[PDB]
Amino acid sequence: PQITLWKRPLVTIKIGGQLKEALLDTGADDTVLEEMNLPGRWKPKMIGGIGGFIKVRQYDQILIEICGHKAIGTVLVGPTPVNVIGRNLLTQIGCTLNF
Amino acid sequence: PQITLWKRPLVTIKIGGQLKEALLDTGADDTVLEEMNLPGRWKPKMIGGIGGFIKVRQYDQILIEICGHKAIGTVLVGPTPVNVIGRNLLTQIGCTLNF
Numbered sequence: 001p002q003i004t005l006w007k008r009p010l011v012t013i014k015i016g017g018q019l020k021e022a023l024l025d026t027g028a029d030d031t032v033l034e035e036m037n038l039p040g041r042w043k044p045k046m047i048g049g050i051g052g053f054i055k056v057r058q059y060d061q062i063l064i065e066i067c068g069h070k071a072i073g074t075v076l077v078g079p080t081p082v083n084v085i086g087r088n089l090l091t092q093i094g095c096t097l098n099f
Numbered sequence: 100p101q102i103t104l105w106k107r108p109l110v111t112i113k114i115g116g117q118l119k120e121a122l123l124d125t126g127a128d129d130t131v132l133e134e135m136n137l138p139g140r141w142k143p144k145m146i147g148g149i150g151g152f153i154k155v156r157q158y159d160q161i162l163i164e165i166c167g168h169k170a171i172g173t174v175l176v177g178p179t180p181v182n183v184i185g186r187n188l189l190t191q192i193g194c195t196l197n198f
């Protein structure tokens with residue numbers, strides 16, 4: 001679809017069999033989700049935002065369906081204020097900015 | 100134009116008679132720019148993201164040119180690690196997400 005930005009670009013995602021709401025975030029290099037249980041091995045990592053760095057759990061090669069489009073990539077899980085879909089997965093679904 | 104997301108969506112902006120590089124950020128409600136000595140009145144504000152909150156100065160009705168597209172709206176100035184163009188201005192230049 002073509003998504004305007006008068007509202008937050010929120011969409012439904014499916015990860016680990018669970019449905020969630022996430023923000024399509026072109027300013028995020030990576031995808032960061034709120035605390036949740038995901039199956040598989042994970043390694044701790046650090047990511048920095050506008051307010052500093054946080055600790056996250058990094059899951060590699062995770063299946064995630066975004067607004068009907070499938071992606072398989074890295075998903076970070078930690079104390080983010082909102083679920084954000086970052087460029088690592090936006091590229092996979094063919095998302096571009098247009099004006 | 101069309102901007103792919105393989106790399107950070109950086110573009111040149113013109114604000115306060117200065118040229119800068121800024122991120123087209125669909126995840127940013129508002130526009131946040133690196134410290135700069137803009138004239139006029141301002142009101143204090145706090146904005147939050149990954150890592151917590153930072154203090155910024157809110158300037159209203161500021162003209163910014165983004166890839167030749169003129170826009171006028173609220174600009175937040177503070178110790179942000181990156182210049183981000185938020186939805187308040189992205190809407191004015193007709194920017195959409197497409198996949």
Ligand SMILES: CCOP(=O)(COc1ccc(C[C@H](NC(=O)O[C@H]2CO[C@H]3OCC[C@H]32)[C@H](O)CN(CC(CC)CC)S(=O)(=O)c2ccc(OC)cc2)cc1)OCC
Nearest residue numbers: 027028029030048049050052126127128129146147148180
């Ligand atoms: C690289 C230079 O230094 P740093 O590494 C960090 O630099 C940065 C800092 C910020 C950004 C932009 C930020 N992206 C981001 O957080 O992405 C994370 C995940 O993926 C990583 O990629 C880039 C960093 C990692 C979001 O697009 C927008 N944000 C909100 C969003 C938060 C997820 C939704 C709530 S917002 O900025 O907080 C914001 C809040 C309220 C506003 O209006 C009221 C306007 C803006 C990009 C690079 O370290 C500094 C210690």
